[PDB]
């Protein structure tokens, strides 16, 4: 049961659907550039 891409708010606009995929890659780059 993975859950990397968080659920968008505000009824999730049709533009936010594109975020549920492009952000999945940017998410890999988020866990590889953080500290505390």
UniProtKB/Swiss-Prot annotation:
KW Membrane (keyword) present: no
GO cellular component: extracellular region
Locations listed in the record: Secreted
Family, similarity comment: Belongs to the NPY family.
Residues modified to Tyrosine amide: 36
Keywords: Amidation, Hormone, Phosphoprotein, Secreted
The encoding gene: PYY
CDD domains, alphabetized: PAH
A GO molecular function held by the record: hormone activity
Highest taxon listed in the record's lineage: Eukaryota
UniProt xrefs under PANTHER family: NEUROPEPTIDE Y/PANCREATIC HORMONE/PEPTIDE YY, PEPTIDE YY-RELATED
PROSITE patterns tied to this protein: PANCREATIC_HORMONE_1, PANCREATIC_HORMONE_2
The name this protein goes by in its record: Peptide YY
Pfam families registered for this protein in UniProt: Hormone_3 (PF00159)
PTM-bearing positions, type Phosphoserine: 13
Function: This gut peptide inhibits exocrine pancreatic secretion, has a vasoconstrictory action and inhibitis jejunal and colonic mobility.
Broad class of the protein's primary localization: secreted
Site (Cleavage): 2-3
Post-translational modification: The peptide YY form is cleaved at Pro-2 by the prolyl endopeptidase FAP (seprase) activity (in vitro) to generate peptide YY(3-36).
């Amino acid at each position: 049961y993975p859950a990397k891409p968080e659920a968008p708010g505000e009824d999730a606009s049709p533009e936010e659907l594109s975020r549920y995929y492009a952000s999945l890659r940017h998410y890999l780059n988020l866990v590889t550039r953080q500290r505390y």
